C-alpha cells in the first residue's frame, strides 16, 4: 500500500491523457479488442434493434506507464481508474439508439511492462436488417461494427483477440440460439488517401429463433 | 468538534482511496459480505428479472484507518463519507440492466482498530431463470452474485458475513418487523454461499 | 556541484553492526532520491536499497531484514545501518543520486566509495624475509608476510628505490596479508653493497629493514 | 520525444475555449454543416416524435489553432477532446424530450492550417406533426432545425459543406452501400435550407 | 500480368493468379465520401466485375494499369 | 532478473582508435541500458543512458546503440584519458550489472624477466618456507605459472598476484608464492618455476637446489 | 485577440454567486420574467398534469458585472456560463411531478451595463384542476405559478415582462387551441410579517379542446 501509493503518485505526476501513448509519433498504437457476449437481452424486429450485454476487453501498451518492480517492493500490477489514462475511442458504428461509446469507466489493470487491460461492460443496441418472411422459424445474421471514431489505421491499429467472440460466460437466451459467431477485421481505402487505411472489427452472430412459443400461442 | 476534526484530518493525511490496504505485497484484503433484504420489489417472468431493495453489509480491515482512542479524546468510532475511503468494488455481477453499483454511497463506520463497516442501499434487477413449467403453482430459485469487478482472489478474499451470535449465519437477513412483505411471493429459503474459482475471482451467491 | 561523500568504518567485526553515512552537497534530499550500491570483492556491483525523496525507503529483497536506511534533511545526511555482517559483505560501498523519468529510475551520480572489510583478525606486524637467487641487472627482493590490516609501505634504501621496483598486490592468507617486492640491481652490487628493503606498517607503527644476502 | 505533445502544448498552453475564433468582435465565424442520417429509427404518431441517429459534420477555421507540419515532424492531424476547443454549440431546436445536444463528445480533429473538424454522433427525438388524413397511405414532412444556442447570426454563420466534385451538399447525406431502410417508412427527399 | 491490389495493406503490386488477366478498379461513395473521397478497390479479375447501380468500374489489361487515383502507373 | 554479459573481458587498444564494447542480456532490455566508466580510486561516472542519451558534459566521443538483447558502446577516437573499466547495467527489471570491460592501452610485446628465490634461512629459522617466483615487465598479461618440486608438480599453497600496467611502459609485473613448512621444504631439494607466455613457443624455467 | 479573456478574468476574480447582486443589501433585485411558450406537449386529465415546453427569459442587472467597453476594444457583450453567476431561484409552485426549478443551465448574455439576459429551456409539468363535466367540449384554464422560493419580496422583486405570455414561437397543438393567455403578478401578506410581501407571477392559458377525435371515435 505504501509502495503502491508511491508508485501511483509517481506514474501520474506528469501523465497526459490527450496524446497517444507512443514513444515516437510515427509509431502506431496497437490495440487488441475482444468481445465477450454475456447475454442476448432482446431482439426487436419492429424497430430492427438487437440489445446485448457485453464486456469489451481492450489491451494495449502505454509507453509511459512502465516501472521497475524492485523499486516498489515487488509490485507487479495495480488497478487504476480508467478516466486518468488515454484510451482508444471505440465506437459502435451501427448504434441504433443506445450509447455509441463506453460509459461505465471501470478500473484498468496495469502491469509493470506497461501492458493495460480494460474490460468495461456495455449494453449495445445495434441496428441490423431483420428478415421476417419465415417468422417464427427465421434466423438473423446481426452484427456489431466497432472502430476508433477519430483515429485512422495509421495511428491506432486494432486487432481482434480471436477470430471468434468469447461465449464462455454467455447466458442461454430463452428465445434465440446462437448458431455461430465470428469476428472479421476490415481495412477500407479511400480516394483521398492511398496511404492511410481505415480499420474496423465487425463481429457477427448468426442466431436462430426457438419457435415453440409462437407454435403454441399463435399457430 | 475539535477532537473529531483533528483525528479526521490526521487519518487522511497521505491516504489514497484508490489503493487497496494490503500491508505486504502478498497480503489479501478479507471482505465479509452480508445481505439484508428490505423489499422484494417484484419478479418479472417476461424479462426473467427479479427486482429487490437491499442493504449490503460489507466489512473489511483497513490498517491505515486505525488509531488509539485514548489519545484522541476517547473517540472510539468515526463516520466517514464512503467516497473518501478505499472501497472494494463489490458489484452485482448477474444484474440485468447494466446497473452494477449501489444506489447511494452513505457513510462508512470506522472502528479505532481499523474495522470498516459499510451498509449501502441498493436497488437491483438481477437476471433469474424462470421455471415456467408449473406456472402459476411454481417456485423460483433466484440468485444474486456479488463479486469484486477488478480484484482477483489473490487481492480481495470474499466470505459470508456472520450472524449476531457469531454463528456462520450464511443467510439473507430479514427483520420480521421491517421487511415489506410481497403480495404474490413467499420467501422460503434464503441461504448464502461462497463460490471458489475452478486471475480468478471468488463469488458470494 | 553534485557531491556525495560516503564515509564510515573500514574494519568491522562479524555479527556486529555497520554504520555508513553519505553526506550530500549541491542538491536537496527533499527532491532527489539516494540509493546504496555494494560491490563485493571479486564480484560485480549490486543494488541494496533507496531512500526516497519523500522520506520512504525500499530495500533489496535479499537484504530486507538486515538493512535500515534513514535520512536527516536538516544537514543533508543519509545513513545506512546493517546487522549480522559476515565475511561475504566485504567490498566497496557507494551512495548514488538517482534520476527519474515518470516511474523509472537509474543511477546518475556516485560517491567515491568506502571500502568495508568484515574480519576479526587483530593488527599484526610483518616479517621481512630476504629473497636472493639460489645461485646487467638481476631482481632481488623482500617478502613482507603476516601483517594486518592493509596497507604496508615498502621502499629500497628509503631514498634509492628508483623506478626499477614493483609492489605486487598483497594477498590474504589465514586472515593476514602477504606482499612481495623486488628491485633490479647489478650482479656485483647486491652481494657486496648493503641493498636493503625498508618496510613500515601504520597499523602498529612497525618498521623493519632487511638487506640482501645469500 | 513525442511530437504530438509538443504540438498540443504549443496550441493549447494559452488558448481560451470560451471566446470565438475571431480577431475582431464584429467578425462572423463561418461554420460548414453536414448532416449524415445513419438510421431512421422510428416515427411515433401517438407521441408525434421522430427518432433518428445522425452524424453532424461541423467544420470551421480557428486561427488560434494554426500550425505547419514542417515545424512538428510532419504531423498533419491532431486529435483533441472537444471540451478543450471553442465550439459553435449547435443544438437541435425542435427536439421534444429536452435533449438539445449530441450523444457522444467525439474528439475534434485539428488539421494544419487551422481547420477544425468535429463529427459527433447524436440521437435525436424531434417534433413531427403528423398529417393523418390519408393514413395508412400517408407521407410526412418531418424537419430537423439546427441552430447555435448561444450566438446570433452576426457571430456564427452556416454554409453547407461542399463535396469532392465541388457541388454543395445542400441536403441530408445518406450512403447507399450501408443505409438500411426502416421497416415502416422510406425517405424520398431531404432538402436543406 | 501484375496489378495493384488493396488486399494487402498498403496497396501492393501482385502477379495475378493463373487464368485471370484483367486489372480492375472499383469505386463508390460511402458515409465519408464528402471528406475521404470514394472507396477504392484494386485487383485482378478474369472478367470485368458486375456493376452495382451506384458503383464505378474500370477494367484494363496492361500491367500497373489500375493505380490508386492518387498514384501513377 | 536479467543477466548481463560483457565482451571482450579485456581490450588492448591504442590512442586514437575507434573501439566498440558489447553487452548482451538474457532477456529483452527494451533500451533501458546505461553505460558508466570507472577508474581506480575514482567515483563512477555515467556515460550513456537509455542506450543513446549522452550524460551532460560527457565528451562527444562516446555513443551508444543497440536493441533487443544486444547493445554496444563506441568511442570514435580513443583518448589516453579513456583507459578504464566500462560497465553496462539495466534498470528495467531489477538492477543488474555486467562484469565490466577493462579497456587498456596497447603495448609492444615484452618477455618476462623471470627469477626464482628460495626461502631464506632467516625465514627457515621461523619455520616458514615460502618459495617465491617473479616475472617482471612482461606484456601482454596472459601468463601461466607452475611450481615443480623434485620434478613433481605442486598446486597446494600456490598463490599469485599481478600489478596493473606500468604508468610508463604499460608492461605487467607478477609475483607468485608457494607456502611450505620447514619439514615439507627439507623433504625436497629440487625446485623450479615454469612460466608460459606468448613471447616464446616453449616455457621459461628458473630453478634452484640445496 | 486576448482582451475577452482579460475581461472575464477581471470580472470573476472576486465574484460571489451567493450574495445578491446589489450595491447595498437593503436594495431589492428587480427581475423581469417572461414566459415564452414553445409547445403544449401534453394534457393529462387523469393525473391533472399539463406538460409544456417553455423558455423562461429572466433579465436583471448584476451591479458587479459592469465594464467599460473602451478598456476592452469595444466589446459590448459576452457569453458566460450561468453556473458562475448569482441567479434568481424561480420555482414552479404548482409543479405536479416534474422539476421544480430550471435544470438546463445554458449561458447568459452579459452586457457592459451589467444587464444579464438568461433564457433557459424548461419542461414544466404544472398541476391543473381539470374539469371533466362537459367532456369532450371542455375548456381548461391552466396556470403556472412562478416565484422565488427562498427570497421574499423585500429582497428580490419579480415583474412580468408583458401582460401576456410570448406565443410568437408557439408550435400549434393537435388537440388544444389556446383561446387566451395572461400573466398576473400577485403580492400576498401573512400574519408573521406586516412589512414583507410575498410575490408570485401566475401565468394562465385558456385552452379549448378540439372535440372532433372524440366525436368520431366515441359518439
Ligand atoms: C453474416 O453477415 C456477415 C456480415 O456482417 C458476413 O461476414 C462476412 O463473412 C465473409 C466470410 O463468410 C467474410 O469474407 C472473408 O473476409 C476475410 C477478411 O477480409 C478482409 O481481410 C482480408 C485479408 O487482409 C489481411 O491479410 C492481408 C494479407 O493476406 C494483409 O495484408 C492485411 O493487412 C490483413 O491482415 C483482405 O484481403 C480483405 O480486403 C479485400 O476484400 C475486400 C472485400 O471483402 C475489399 O474491399 C478489399 O479492397 C480487398 O479486396 C481485395 O481482395 C479481393 C478478394 O477478396 C479482390 O476482389 C479485390 O480486388 C482486392 O484484391 C478484407 O479486408 C477474407 O480474408 C476472406 O477471403 C476469403 O474469400 C476470398 C474470396 O472472396 C478469397 O480470395 C480469400 O482467399 C479467402 O478465401 C479462402 O481463403 C483461404 C485460401 O486458402 C482459405 O483458408 C479460406 O478458408 C477461404 O476459403 C473473405 O472475403 C467477410 O469479410 C465478412 N464481412 C463482414 C462485413 O464482416 C457473414 O458471412 C454472414 N454470415 C452468414 C450469412 O452466415
Ligand atoms: C415541408 O415543410 C417545410 C416546413 O414547413 C416547408 O417549407 C416551408 O413551406 C412554407 C409554406 O408552407 C413556406 O412559407 C412560404 O414559402 C414561400 C415560398 O415561395 C415564400 O414566398 C413565403 O414568403 C416568406 O418567405 C420569403 C422567402 O423567405 C420572403 O421573401 C417573404 O417575404 C416571406 O417572408 C413563405 O416562406 C416556407 O418558406 C418554407 N420554408 C422552407 C425553409 O422551405 C416545405 O414546403 C414542406 N415541403 C413539402 C414537400 O411539403
Ligand atoms: C496559418 O499560418 C500560415 C503560416 O503563417 C499562414 O500562411 C500565410 O498566409 C498569408 C496570408 O495568405 C501569406 O501572406 C503568407 O505568406 C503565408 N505564409 C506561409 C508560411 O504559408 C496561413 O494564412 C495561416 N492561416 C490561418 C487561417 O491563420
Ligand atoms: Cu483580445
Tell me which residue has cell 463561418: D30
Residues F89 and F152 in one domain: no
Of D11, D113, D115, D116, the one to substitute when testing ligand 3's pocket (max ligand atoms within 8 A of C-beta) is D113
**E strand spans, chain C:** 3-7, 11-12, 18-25, 34-40, 46-51, 57-59, 67-72, 77-82, 91-101, 104-110, 114-118, 127-131, 138-147, 153-156, 165-173, 176-185, 196-201, 206-211
Residue with cell 438539445: D100
Residue C31's Cα: distance from chain center in Å?
32
Q: Can you tell me the distance from the alpha carbon of B111 to that of C167, in angstroms, rounded to the nearest whole number? A: 72
| F82 and F159 together in one domain | no
End-to-end CA distance of chain B: 42
What is the full DSSP assignment across chain A? -HHHHHHHHHHSSS--SSS-S-SSTTSPEEEEEEEEEEEEEEEETTTTEEEEEEEEEEEEE-GGG---GGGGTT--EEEEEGGGS----EEETTB-SS-SS-----EEEEETTSEEEE--EEEEEEE-----TTTTS-EEEEEEEEEESS--TTTEEEEESSSS-B-TTPPPPSSEEEEEEEEEEEEEEETTEEEEEEEEEEEEEEEEE-THHHHHHT-
Are F119 and F102 in a shared domain? no
CB of A48 closer than 8 Å to CB of D183? yes
Q: Residue G140: which of G34, G35, G48, G39 has the closest Cα?
A: G48
Q: Give the Cα separation of B114 and D92 in Å (integer).
A: 53
Look up residue B85 and give its three cell numbers: 475511503
User: Quick one: which of F107, F115, F116, F85 has its CA closest to F172?
Assistant: F107
With a CB cutoff of 8 Å and minimum separation 6, the contacts of C173 are: F159, F179
**Contact yes or no for A129/A48 (Cβ under 8 A):** yes
C159 burial class (0-12, 13-18, 19+ CB within 10 angstroms)? exposed
Q: Which residue has the cell 533489496?
A: C60
Q: Ligand 1: which atom is nearest the Cα of residue E49? A: 57
Same domain, F100 and F2: yes
Ligand 2 contact, D133 CB (< 6 A) = no
**In Å, how far are B135, C64, G168 from C80, measured between CA atoms?**
76, 13, 83
Q: What are phi and psi of B158, to 5 degrees?
A: -90, 150
Which of A52, A51, A53, A105 is CA-nearest to residue A79? A105
Q: Note the residue count of chain G.
A: 219
**How does DSSP classify residue B158?**
E
First to last CA, chain D: 48
Q: Tell me the pairing of strands G29-44 and G156-160.
A: parallel
> What is the rounded CA–CA span in Å between residue A197 and residue A179?
32
Q: How much distance in Å is there from the Cα of D76 to the middle of ligand 3?
A: 16
Counting as contact any 3 or more CB pairs under 8 A, the partners of D are: A, E, G
- For residues C118 and F109, the answer to whether their CB atoms sit within 8 Å is no
| Ligand 1, atom 15, residue with closest C-alpha | A184
Please state, in angstroms and as integers, the Cα–Cα distance from residue D138 to each residue in D184, D189, F52, G215, following that order.
Answer: 11, 15, 74, 23
How buried is residue A18: exposed, middle or buried, by Cβ count under 10 Å (0-12/13-18/19+)?
middle
Cβ of D113 below 6 Å from ligand 3 = yes
Q: Is A80 on the interface with B (CB under 8 A)?
A: yes
> Alpha-carbon distance D95 to G3, whole Å?
36
Classify domain C121-214 at the CATH topology level. Immunoglobulin-like (2.60.40)
Q: Return residue ranges of chain C for CATH 2.60.40.10.
A: 121-214
Q: Is the CB of D114 under 6 A from ligand 3?
A: yes
Q: String of b and e for E59-71 (b: at least 16 CB within 10 Å)? A: ebeeeebbbbeee
Distance CA B118, CA B106 (A): 8
The reply to whether residue F117 touches residue C138, judged by beta carbons under 8 angstroms, is no
Indicate whether F64 and F154 sit together in one domain.
no
Determine the distance separating the centroid of ligand 1 and the alpha carbon of A163, expressed in angstroms: 13
Residue G90 vs residues D100, G32, G156: alpha-carbon distances, Å: 22, 11, 11
The C-alpha atoms of residue F101 and residue F85 are separated, in whole angstroms, by 5
The angle formed by the CA atoms of residues F107, F112 and F114, to the nearest 5 degrees, is 165
Same domain, yes or no: F29 and F98 = yes
- Angle in degrees, CA G191, G193, G197, rounded to 5: 105
In total, chain B counts a number of residues equal to 205
- CATH number of residue F78's parent domain: 2.60.40.10
Q: Can you tell me which residue has the cell 459467431?
A: A181
Three-state SS letters, chain F: CCCEEEECCEEEECCCCCEEEEEEECCCCCCCEEEEEECCCCCCEEEEECCCEECCCCCCCEEEEEECCEEEEEECCCCHHHCEEEEEEECCCCCEECCCEEEEECCCCECCEEEEECCCHHHHCCCECCEEEEEEEEECCCEEEEEEECCEEECCCEEEEECCCCCCCCCEEEEEEECCEHHHHHCCCCEEEEEEECCCCCCEEEEECC
Gap between the Cα atoms of A162 and D1, Å rounded: 34
Q: Is C159 on the interface with A (CB under 8 A)?
A: no
Chain C hits for F99, CB-CB cut-off 8 Å, are: 44
What the block records as the C-alpha cell of A128 is 441490423
Alpha-carbon span D3 to D74, nearest angstrom:
9
E/D Cβ contact: 3+ pairs below 8 Å: yes
Peptide bond into A136 cis (omega under 30): yes
**DSSP strands (E only) in C32-113:** 34-40, 46-51, 57-59, 67-72, 77-82, 91-101, 104-110
Q: Which residues of B137-164 are buried (b: 16+ CB within 10 A; e: fewer)?
A: eeeeebebebbbbbbbbebbbbebbeee
Task: List residues near ligand 1 (CB under 6 A).
Answer: A 141, 143, 184, 186-187, 202, 204, 206; E 5-9, 41-43
Separation of alpha carbons D173 and C136, rounded Å: 106
**What distance in Å separates the CA atoms of residue B160 and residue F175, rounded to the nearest whole number?**
76
Q: List chain F residues with CB under 8 Å of C134.
A: 116-118, 191, 207-210
User: Which residues 120-179 of chain C have a CB within 8 Å of chain F?
Assistant: 127, 129-135, 138-141, 143, 145, 163, 166-171, 173, 178
For residues F112 and F81, membership in a common domain is answered with no
Among G5, G107, G123, select the one facing D98 at the smallest CB separation: G123
Architecture (CATH level 2) of domain E1-73? Ribbon (2.10)
Candidates F3, F2, F1, F7; CA nearest to F100 is F7
CA distance C142 to D17: 86
**B96 vs A contacts (CB less than 8 Å):** 39, 41
For residue F61, what are the domain limits? 1-107
Residue G199 · residue G189 · CB < 8 Å: no
Q: Are F39 and F103 in contact (CB under 8 A)?
A: no
Resolution value in angstroms: 2.5
- Check if the beta carbon of residue E6 is closer than 8 Å to that of residue E40: yes
Residue B114 phi/psi, 5° resolution? 95, 0
> Rounded to an integer, what distance in angstroms lies between the CA atom of residue C106 and that of residue C101?
9
User: Which three cell numbers mark A199?
Assistant: 480499420
**A69 φ, ψ to 5°?**
-60, -30
Q: What's the total number of domains in chain F?
A: 2
Domain's final residue, options F51, F85, F107? F107
C57 φ, ψ (degrees, to nearest 5)? -135, 160
- Would an 8 Å CB–CB cutoff place F155 in contact with chain C? no
Q: D170: Cβ below 6 Å to ligand 2?
A: no
Residue with the smallest CA separation from ligand 1 atom 10 is A184
Interface with A, mutate which of D84, D104, D119, D165 (most A CBs under 10 A)? D104
**Ligand 2 close to Cβ of residue D139 (< 6 A):** no
Q: Which residues of F touch C113 (CB under 8 A)?
A: 43
Residues of A in contact with E36 (CB under 8 A): 190-193, 198
For residue B69, the 8-state DSSP code is: T
d(CA C147, CA C177): 5
Give alpha helix (H) positions in C104-157.
none
Q: Are strands F10-13 and C67-72 parallel, antiparallel or unpaired?
A: unpaired
Q: Residues D190, D34: contact at Cβ < 8 Å?
A: no
A185 CA from centroid of ligand 1 (Å): 9
| SS3 state at B4 | helix
User: Among F75, F107, F139, which residue terminates a domain?
Assistant: F107
Cβ-based burial of D192 (10 A; exposed 0-12, middle 13-18, buried ≥19): middle
Nearest CA residue ID for atom 42, ligand 2: D193
Residue pair D133/D139 in contact (Cβ under 8 Å)? The answer is: no
Q: How many angstroms separate the Cα of G163 from the Cα of each of G40, G160, G183?
A: 20, 7, 6
Q: How many CB atoms lie within 10 A of CB D1?
A: 9
F82 φ/ψ angles, rounded to the nearest 5 degrees:
-95, 0
CA–CA distance, F190 with F114 (Å, rounded to integer)? 18
Beta bridge partners, C19, equal C81
Q: Which long-range contacts (CB under 8 A, 24 or more apart) does F20-24 make?
A: F20/F72, F20/F73, F20/F74, F21/F72, F21/F73, F21/F74, F21/F86, F21/F88, F21/F101, F21/F103, F22/F70, F22/F71, F22/F72, F23/F66, F23/F70, F23/F71, F23/F72, F23/F73, F23/F88, F23/F98, F24/F69, F24/F70, F24/F71
D touches G (3+ CB pairs < 8 Å)?
yes
Mutation choice for E interface testing from D115, D159, D164, D168 by most E CBs within 10 A: D164
Q: Which residues of F touch C6 (CB under 8 A)?
A: none
Mutate to test the interface with D, among E26, E27, E34, E38 (most CBs of D within 10 A): E34
- Between the CA of C27 and the centroid of ligand 1 the distance, in Å, is 63
Q: What is the rounded CA–CA span in Å between residue A56 and residue A105?
A: 12
Strands F101-105 and C67-72, bridge-based pairing = unpaired
Question: What would the grid cell of residue A192 be?
Answer: 483521398
Q: Around Cβ A76, how many Cβ atoms within 10 Å?
A: 11
Chain-centroid distance, C-alpha B24 = 25
Q: Residue A11 and residue C60: Cβ atoms within 8 Å?
A: no
Which method, experimentally, gave rise to this model?
cryo-EM
F70 Cβ partners below 8 Å, 6+ apart? F22, F23, F24, F25
The atom number, within ligand 3, closest to the CA of D114 reads: 27
Distance (Å) from the C-alpha of residue A192 to the closest C-alpha of chain E? Answer: 5
Q: Which chains does F contact via 3+ CB–CB distances below 8 A?
A: A, C
Exposed, middle or buried, E2 (CB in 10 Å: 0-12/13-18/19+)?
middle
Q: Which three cell numbers stand for residue F156?
A: 597446494
Q: ∠ CA(A80), CA(A85), CA(A88), 5° rounding?
A: 120
Same domain, F78 and F131: no
Q: Ligand 4 centre from D14 Cα, in Å?
A: 12
Select from B36, B146, B18, B35 the least CA-distant residue to B87: B18
Contact F185, F124 (CB under 8 A): yes
Specify the pairing of strand F70-75 against strand F62-67. Answer: antiparallel
In the reported structure, the alpha carbon of residue C208 is separated from the centroid of ligand 3 by a whole-number distance in angstroms of 89
Inter-chain touch A8–B19, beta carbons under 8 Å: yes
- Domain finish residue from F107, F141, F158: F107
Place of cell 628509503: C158
Could you tell me how many residues make up chain D?
193
Residues G163, G175: Cα–Cα separation, whole Å:
25
Say how far apart CA A132 and CA A46 lie, in whole Å.
Answer: 10
Please, which residues have CB within 8 angstroms of residue D141's CB and are 6 or more apart in sequence?
A: D131
Helix (H, G, I), strand (E, B) or coil at C194: coil
Q: Same domain, yes or no, for F87 and F185? A: no
Mutate to test the pocket of ligand 2, among D127, D134, D141 (most ligand atoms within 8 A of CB): D141
Distances (CA, A) of B41 to B46, B97, B126, C34: 15, 15, 12, 61
Q: Which residues contact G10 (CB under 8 A, 6 or more apart)?
A: G67
Amino acid at each position: 500500500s505504501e509502495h503502491e501509493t508511491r508508485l501511483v503518485a509517481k506514474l501520474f505526476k506528469d501523465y497526459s491523457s490527450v496524446v497517444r501513448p507512443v514513444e515516437d509519433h510515427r509509431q502506431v498504437v496497437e490495440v487488441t479488442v475482444g468481445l465477450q457476449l454475456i447475454q442476448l437481452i432482446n431482439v426487436d424486429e419492429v424497430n430492427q434493434i438487437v440489445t446485448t450485454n457485453v464486456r469489451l476487453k481492450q489491451q494495449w501498451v502505454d509507453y509511459n506507464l512502465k516501472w521497475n518492480p524492485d523499486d516498489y517492493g515487488g509490485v507487479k500490477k495495480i488497478h487504476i481508474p480508467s478516466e486518468k489514462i488515454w484510451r482508444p475511442d471505440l465506437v459502435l458504428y451501427n448504434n441504433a439508439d443506445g450509447d455509441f461509446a463506453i460509459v461505465k469507466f471501470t478500473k484498468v489493470l496495469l502491469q509493470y511492462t506497461g501492458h493495460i487491460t480494460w474490460t468495461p461492460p456495455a449494453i449495445f443496441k445495434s441496428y441490423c436488417e431483420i428478415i421476417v418472411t419465415h417468422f417464427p422459424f427465421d434466423e438473423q445474421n446481426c452484427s456489431m461494427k466497432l472502430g476508433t471514431w477519430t483515429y485512422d489505421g495509421s495511428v491506432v491499429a486494432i486487432n481482434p483477440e480471436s477470430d471468434q467472440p468469447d461465449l464462455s460466460n454467455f447466458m442461454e437466451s430463452g428465445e434465440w440460439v446462437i448458431k455461430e459467431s465470428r469476428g472479421w477485421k476490415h481495412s477500407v481505402t479511400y480516394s483521398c488517401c492511398p496511404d492511410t487505411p481505415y480499420l474496423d472489427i465487425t463481429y457477427h452472430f448468426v442466431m436462430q429463433r426457438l419457435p415453440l412459443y409462437f407454435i403454441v400461442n399463435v399457430i | 468538534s475539535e477532537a473529531e476534526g483533528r483525528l479526521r484530518e490526521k487519518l487522511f493525511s497521505g491516504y489514497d482511496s484508490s489503493v487497496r490496504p494490503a500491508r505486504e505485497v502478498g497480503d489479501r484484503v478479507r471482505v465479509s459480505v452480508g445481505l439484508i433484504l428490505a423489499q422484494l420489489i417484484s419478479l418479472n417472468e417476461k424479462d426473467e428479472e427479479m427486482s429487490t431493495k437491499v442493504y449490503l453489509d460489507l466489512e473489511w480491515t483497513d490498517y491505515r484507518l486505525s488509531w488509539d482512542p485514548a489519545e484522541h479524546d476517547g473517540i472510539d468510532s468515526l463516520r466517514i463519507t464512503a467516497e473518501s475511503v478505499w472501497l472494494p468494488d463489490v458489484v452485482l455481477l448477474n444484474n440485468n440492466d447494466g446497473n452494477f453499483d449501489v444506489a447511494l454511497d452513505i457513510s462508512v463506520v470506522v472502528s479505532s482498530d481499523g474495522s470498516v463497516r459499510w451498509q449501502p442501499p441498493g436497488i437491483y434487477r438481477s437476471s433469474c431463470s424462470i421455471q415456467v413449467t408449473y406456472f402459476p403453482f411454481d417456485w423460483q430459485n433466484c440468485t444474486m452474485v456479488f463479486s469484486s469487478y477488478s480484484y482477483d482472489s489473490s487481492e480481495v478474499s470474499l466470505q459470508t458475513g456472520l450472524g449476531p451470535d457469531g454463528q456462520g449465519h450464511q443467510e439473507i437477513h430479514i427483520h420480521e418487523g421491517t421487511f415489506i412483505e410481497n403480495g404474490q411471493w413467499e420467501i422460503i429459503h434464503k441461504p448464502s454461499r461462497l463460490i471458489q474459482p475452478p486471475g480468478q475471482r471468488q463469488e458470494v451467491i | 556541484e553534485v557531491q556525495l561523500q560516503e564515509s564510515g568504518p573500514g574494519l568491522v567485526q562479524p555479527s556486529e553492526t555497520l554504520s555508513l553515512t553519505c553526506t550530500v552537497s549541491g542538491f536537496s534530499l527533499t527532491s532527489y532520491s539516494v540509493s546504496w550500491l555494494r560491490q563485493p570483492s571479486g564480484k560485480g556491483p549490486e543494488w541494496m536499497g533507496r531512500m526516497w525523496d519523500d522520506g520512504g525507503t525500499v530495500y533489496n529483497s535479499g537484504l530486507k531484514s538486515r538493512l535500515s536506511i534513514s535520512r536527516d534533511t536538516s544537514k543533508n545526511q543519509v545513513f545506512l545501518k546493517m546487522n549480522s555482517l559476515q565475511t561475504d559483505d566485504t567490498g566497496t560501498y557507494y551512495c548514488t543520486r538517482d534520476e527519474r523519468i515518470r516511474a523509472i529510475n537509474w543511477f546518475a551520480y556516485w560517491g567515491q566509495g568506502t571500502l568495508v572489510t568484515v574480519s576479526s583478525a587483530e593488527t599484526t606486524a610483518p616479517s621481512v624475509y630476504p629473497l636472493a637467487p639460489g645461485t646487467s641487472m638481476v631482481t632481488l627482493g623482500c617478502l613482507v608476510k603476516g601483517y594486518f590490516p592493509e596497507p604496508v609501505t615498502v621502499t629500497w634504501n628509503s631514498g634509492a628505490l628508483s623506478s626499477g621496483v614493483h609492489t605486487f598486490p598483497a594477498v590474504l592468507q589465514s586472515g593476514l596479508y602477504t606482499l612481495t617486492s623486488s628491485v633490479t640491481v647489478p650482479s656485483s652490487t647486491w652481494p657486496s653493497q648493503t641493498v636493503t628493503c625498508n618496510v613500515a606498517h601504520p597499523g602498529q607503527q612497525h618498521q623493519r629493514w632487511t638487506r640482501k644476502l645469500c | 520525444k513525442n511530437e504530438e505533445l509538443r504540438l498540443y502544448h504549443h496550441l493549447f498552453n494559452n488558448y481560451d475555449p470560451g471566446s470565438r475564433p475571431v480577431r475582431e468582435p464584429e467578425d462572423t465565424v463561418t461554420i460548414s454543416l453536414k448532416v449524415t442520417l445513419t438510421n431512421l429509427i422510428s416515427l411515433n404518431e401517438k407521441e408525434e416524435t421522430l427518432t433518428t441517429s445522425v452524424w453532424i459534420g461541423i467544420d470551421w477555421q480557428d486561427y488560434r489553432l494554426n500550425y505547419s507540419k514542417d515545424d512538428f515532424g510532419g504531423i498533419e492531424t491532431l486529435r483533441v477532446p472537444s471540451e478543450l476547443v471553442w465550439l459553435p454549440e449547435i443544438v437541435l431546436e425542435n427536439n421534444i424530450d429536452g435533449q438539445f445536444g449530441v450523444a457522444y463528445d467525439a474528439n475534434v480533429l485539428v488539421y494544419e492550417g487551422g481547420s477544425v473538424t468535429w463529427l459527433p454522433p447524436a440521437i435525436y427525438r424531434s417534433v413531427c406533426a403528423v398529417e393523418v388524413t390519408y393514413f395508412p397511405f400517408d407521407w410526412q414532412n418531418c424537419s430537423l432545425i439546427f441552430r447555435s444556442q448561444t450566438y446570433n447570426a452576426e457571430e456564427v454563420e452556416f454554409t453547407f459543406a461542399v463535396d469532392n466534385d465541388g457541388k454543395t451538399i445542400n441536403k441530408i447525406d445518406i450512403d447507399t452501400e450501408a443505409y438500411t431502410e426502416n421497416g415502416e417508412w422510406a425517405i424520398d427527399f431531404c432538402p436543406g435550407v | 500480368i501484375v496489378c495493384h491490389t488493396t488486399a494487402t495493406s498498403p496497396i501492393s503490386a501482385v502477379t495475378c493468379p493463373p487464368g485471370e488477366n484483367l486489372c480492375y478498379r472499383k469505386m463508390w461513395c460511402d458515409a465519408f465520401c464528402s471528406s475521404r473521397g470514394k472507396v477504392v478497390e484494386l485487383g485482378c479479375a478474369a472478367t470485368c466485375p458486375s456493376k452495382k447501380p451506384y458503383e464505378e468500374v474500370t477494367c484494363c489489361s496492361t500491367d500497373k494499369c489500375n493505380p490508386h487515383p492518387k498514384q501513377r502507373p | 532478473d536479467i543477466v548481463i554479459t560483457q565482451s571482450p573481458s579485456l581490450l588492448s587498444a591504442s590512442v586514437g582508435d575507434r573501439v566498440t564494447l558489447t553487452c548482451k542480456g538474457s532477456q529483452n532490455i527494451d533500451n533501458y541500458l546505461a553505460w558508466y566508466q570507472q577508474k581506480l580510486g575514482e567515483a563512477p561516472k555515467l556515460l550513456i543512458y537509455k542506450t543513446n542519451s549522452l550524460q551532460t558534459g560527457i565528451p562527444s566521443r562516446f555513443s551508444g546503440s543497440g536493441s533487443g538483447t544486444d547493445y554496444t558502446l563506441t568511442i570514435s577516437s580513443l583518448h589516453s584519458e579513456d583507459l578504464a573499466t566500462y560497465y553496462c547495467y539495466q534498470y528495467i527489471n531489477g538492477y543488474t550489472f555486467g562484469t565490466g570491460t577493462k579497456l587498456e592501452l596497447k603495448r609492444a610485446d615484452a618477455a618476462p624477466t623471470v627469477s626464482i628465490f628460495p626461502p631464506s634461512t632467516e625465514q627457515l629459522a621461523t619455520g616458514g618456507a615460502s618459495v617465491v617466483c617473479l616475472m617482471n615487465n612482461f606484456y601482454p598479461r596472459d601468463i601461466s605459472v607452475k611450481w615443480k618440486i623434485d620434478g613433481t608438480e605442486r598446486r597446494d599453497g600456490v598463490l599469485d598476484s599481478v600489478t596493473d600496467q606500468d604508468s610508463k611502459d604499460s608492461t605487467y609485473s607478477m609475483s607468485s608464492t608457494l607456502s611450505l613448512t620447514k619439514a615439507d621444504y627439507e623433504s625436497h631439494n629440487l625446485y623450479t618455476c615454469e612460466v608460459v607466455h606468448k613471447t616464446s613457443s616453449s616455457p621459461v624455467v628458473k630453478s634452484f637446489n640445496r
